[PDB]
RNA sequence: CUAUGGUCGGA
RNA sequence: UCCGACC
RNA sequence: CUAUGGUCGGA
RNA sequence: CCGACC
């Protein structure tokens, strides 16, 4: 224990005042947030009484407004607010809505202040909706709390000295989180799980250097409204040791290593849709997994089991899938993995089966929540995959001819790049074609979410949506530079991402869920692939794969055996199973294991049927993996072993359960070297140009062990890595960064590595060229139509000096806004801040009334907004382009659509925001209209 | 009427002798419209003209070709992008009976049509087509000059004995086919007759359109059919084979003799019978198929194609066993309709008319229903199944509509599903608009909902929507279309690889065939029903097992029948083949399970009434002797004799309608009268190829003797909207139309007819501008004078409305309402070319809405629906809750509702 | 330095 | 860029 | 007097 | 309404 660290930790959480005690949790959570955002103290006695209006509020703004009446909060702008729908569910829906759960979340960062009197600064995140899990469905979404705390074991200079200077500081923080309850919004929260959230950006509001953080989950053991011994406001006291007992059934699972049992807490936190509750007589718990016909004892169906057609149909019905899913990824009590339809089920009786490989603990499957099929994902329409940097070295190593494939793969890159550019170049010629291309290039989900095309100031947020909106109003990309600039910026970034990452697209490739052949119709080295609908490559299209060789691989891929070549055979017996890849249950070892120790529990495989990539590949036998026992030490302490220290009985289990949390939290907070070790393997293999050498194979095994550290209880310290680096590896500790990690070639001579040849010799030369050709194929800013209103007002100015003053004030105000735009808290807030000043410009009688048209609620739909936009265009079309568009792009589109319309030639349509989002381009119309001209 | 026939065609005078054919045709057409007799000013501007309008302008002293066609005719040699321009004419009987011309000629404007082998080889300019009223017509409107029939032989002689002169070229008839009953241009059967230009003013004795070489029709036919080696064939069938030359086919490639595989024997039955199992179908290379995709713009290689290669006519399928990159094609005796050397490129060019494409649901034909009941193990079960499906389907259509109307977004999707306007949109480039609203009511509903109007809350929209369903329900009453989702019409191919057994078929889809709840990419382990139209015999529908063979997996959007077995399955299907035949394939269990097969019937020999002219070309030549002159005379005689055979009236339509009427009265399709009628109608369809001669006398003999009932047979009850028969309806069609569909339709109709919280015409949002300018007018007489004038002027227009051309006249007066100072300029924007986009138009629409929503509702929406939509979109927008978009007319017509958006949003 | 790849969802 | 599950 | 069914485009 | 095709 370290005293200085402990003193700062005594009061880091926001306090709950007596006045707020009556408040519902949702209002309490939101009111505390505003007070913190505005610096006001909740317990401050200078001004506080509960407002009955808060008890019955469907908008947070109403609650926050009553507080803003006090001057204390009046100066600061309002903080991010919970969406109204989430707030309503928290107050009246019991924190759950159509499977979704409101989540109380917080992010914690270190206090810059080093004063001995809070170590951590806390921001409570707004109320948000997130898919529910088993535990939220069983004990209440209101009894759970997530925090992102900076990891005590961070080796960053950013860490405060109090933690770094005083050893034992790590233990004090772990004790602080795991020893006792934490008070917040009237509830006592106890910790029960923690997982790595990765290196994260410290909050700017509080502070700039990334620090490793940890997600710690809390459970409300008790609260003010809690009752000793169903509604969120009247929960019954319950100890963390009891929720965990309900989930893991600890009594029958004391034989497991406690660190792995702690790992299984995630299965109760997995975000899943609840489908149905099977009856006990409908569950077939297999006691033996499918085993090798050879006799090797290898399991051939790891994590995959069968399910009835009726169960699959209910999944479709509950999720509105529209087609019955051949396979699903879900959890069923202790069972985790995949479930596939039994092709032999002819009845309508519900049934599911579990396998040992699936059941992660011993479960009795009695509670309804332990017999509920929770679905996390469904096999769905397949999309084309690409190559990645990890598959290239392995592809070169197993190539029969390395030189042939290096050029062959490079061909796919140059051909795809020229084709990518050619389609855009031709489409840019006609706006109907460019719109259709832009829609194909990328926003349905945002449109459904916002019920409108989301807008940042006066233009659509998305650049693809901005281009389509402007073209829909009559703007030509070949005639308006602003539109041209967007397409240029778009392609440049898309090419930049190809330069930065060699995501070489392979059309005859896809990521498909891996399933096992329970029916034994597939022989070893034979796979079955079926597609729900036509899979289209530009040259040809497929509904199934037959009479072809395919390459199956999984990420992460390090070993030469990680990519394997197999023959695709279509078995009419497995025709119903579509959008899945079925490996054989025959053979000594499951094919999935060859793929980076893969399973059929949710794993997806990279399937390539491209011949120019498949036929140059030869298979490798699985490698002899080294024994790294000295470097990697595994804690296999069982729950029973922890229990012996305490004794026998309920109290002993309760103490043991808390001890498992404390011990596991230390193991979790321990530093992970998976990234450093994988990066080292890349550097070493680059220097040696070998992914097959003994150092590579050793490093491939170490990275393979490190990824499974939490489940396998592996303790690895910086010392063991150095010890491993100096003994098994050739006494090299710090290795040079590779040339590819660099934008421009800094190497001596022609590129030597496969990735180097592709990045600097096949991609950058082609990319630099295709851009120039596209630029040459690609136009002013000026538009005599976008300034019709300016001409109208100058003519009016000649008639009246009052008409002249309005223009003078308008022009000067527009210039002030431009100065602000040049000067300007992230980018969106700055844009809105300039936009508010833009919309501020206002007429300030008969002319003013005609200009303001105040009967219209949106002033941005009045004639004055149009004149204000036309004048801005005349003022800044050459001077500052982005200003006129980012601000008045919407009104400019109105003007163009008004000007382009010509008598007797149809009628333009003013579409409501919502109805505009629903419409989509008709490809059929585009081809036929193009045909009539051509 | 020979004297009338002397001057039928428009005359060509010396002043037009030195003229391009395209200009001559167009100028002749214009003189005819203006009735200026051709019989001396020739403008040379025409020869280099690229638009007819410019040529026509020269004729300013006293139905028009598109620009592309005229250009192609003038400088493209009459051929562009495969298309050939066509000189078509329509002939109609002259009203005057003066011994004046018998027919009146209207030369149709030059137009693009798909090319044929004959147009490609000899030039489209050498081909002329006409639609002539048939001489054998029994209609009263036939002029007495021919009605007396002292005449049929003479008119046939006029068409075939000699050449005809129209635009400087001599035209001789080579082929004729039935064009059906066609209304005379301002109903009588017409025959299409095809003419070829043997000689012309620009022709050369012993190539450019204006520099052709003289070629007789006999020679052209000799090139196509190789008559020297085809004398054995009956002349009537050889005349029939001319159609293959005139078939509209896309030219893909010319194959070299070494790449052409000719087979001396077809695939025969392995069980000795010697029946043919591959009639009309052969194999091609994956490379040949790839070029069909490349030249035709297909997004995938076709697995089977329908086309012609020389003598061969039929279907070609990719060899699943072909691993090569070399072009090859196969020919079989069944496909070849004449002996061809395959020496000329035009006779070695693969010509594709159609490709196997994505399949669609077909539904149940009325012909199929009697056969289904006749061959069902339990008839009552079959009746209850199809009937219950119809009841369920009808309820679903209505249920979807009622739920859809509740939410705008949802209703828009249904309206698009109900009717597609893409054909109209692409042609106009915009949504067609009459006055102030879209021309189509369905488009009007979408346009107004897009601006924010709700059908449930707005009366105008509700009334239109109610009318649309009323029309759809009325359409349902008139015709009983039972629709089966698990049904499709698929091209039939044969198994060249021997995988399938006798009762097995293989079907694979190019994509996902979607049924309401289930989806298919292949058919496996299911029983299917295979049938063809026309289906009359009890055996014309057969039940088979669908087995997916991976060996045939690359063949998609085709159903493969077995080569094993005594008789091919196709023959069972109304005497079918694999030459382009499409089978109705149904895998809906409830339809399939009750069916049990029937063997092919023993058909009666009706030779007494059906006689075949099996006279051969050699027999016709024997009359003329031996030699080229004898062949020329025989070829011309065949055209003349064949023209008579073809012009003979066809009784298939009357005979089929009789079988339908008698079989309905008997309620049997398996009885002796039905089998006899079925054989007669089966033979009559193949009359042209088989030389069958049938006359009213032959028909009256069959009716008097075999069929019985030589009396007018009454029409079936199902042919009428309601059930006037006695008792509950007992015929399958009558039960389904009157005892099942009508009540269900009526129940929904009563529900719609049966129906303050409801649709109201009033919208406070639409009177916004009126109230805005009232407040100004109350404090300004100057504006008030303008306001009063507009209100009264609208009143004048409202009086003018009264109640397509008329609506436009009112719209013109409505647009005329315009101002007649700073205010008037703001109201009427000069900068805007379309003043319908100005502020004044919105004010006039608002003032018109308030004044006439109660009294003259239709007047406001027809005149100002456009502006009312703008006003609605403006008023409904709320600050910071999105931005309404002003689409252009063109960009608007190119947008379609995203079905995924409608479903996802409703779930929200 | 520095501390992984991949699938998908979001605002 | 940020946020959240999954292997 | 009345004079067929089906598949595919369309204007 | 006018075109292919079986
Ligand atoms: N964060 C990650 N980064 C890279 N690879 C990962 C990551 N997470 C999972 N994988 C891959 O997926 C595998 C994880 O396997 P599982 O998630 O199936 N867990 P497993 O070890 O099988 O234990 P059970 O829960 O099944 O009893 C790893 O070995 C990696 O190959
Ligand atoms: N106008 C029509 N009305 C009804 N059925 C028709 C019609 N035209 C064609 N069919 C159908 O298609 C069949 C024609 O068969 P084909 O078009 O296959 N010709 P076919 O007699 O076999 O001789 P070939 O040219 O192949 O040597 C008819 O028997 C009908 O089943
Ligand atoms: Ca594993
Ligand atoms: Ca796994
Ligand atoms: Ca696993
Ligand atoms: Ca036939
Ligand atoms: Ca990652």
TrEMBL record, chain B:
What's the domain of life for this entry?
Answer: Eukaryota
Identify the residues that bind Mg(2+) 4.
Answer: 577, 579, 581
- Would I find Metal-binding among this entry's keywords? yes
What are its GO biological-process terms?
siRNA processing
Binding of Mg(2+) 2 occurs at 575
The UniProt record gives the binding positions of GTP 2 as 306, 308, 313, 353, 533, 581
Per the record, its GO cellular-component terms are:
nuclear RNA-directed RNA polymerase complex
Tell me which EC number(s) this protein carries. Answer: 2.7.7.48
Residue numbers binding Ca(2+) 1:
575
Residues that coordinate or bind ATP: 241, 313, 337, 689-690
Q: Which residues bind Mg(2+) 3?
A: 575, 577
Record keywords, A-Z: ATP-binding, Calcium, GTP-binding, Metal-binding, Nucleotide-binding, Nucleotidyltransferase, RNA-binding, RNA-directed RNA polymerase, Transferase
Q: Give the binding site residues for Ca(2+) 2.
A: 577, 579, 581
Q: Which reaction does it catalyse?
A: RNA(n) + a ribonucleoside 5'-triphosphate = RNA(n+1) + diphosphate
Record's signal peptide: none
Q: Which family does it belong to?
A: Belongs to the RdRP family.
Q: What is this protein called?
A: RNA-dependent RNA polymerase
Summarize which stretch of the complete protein this chain spans. 394 to 1369 of 1402
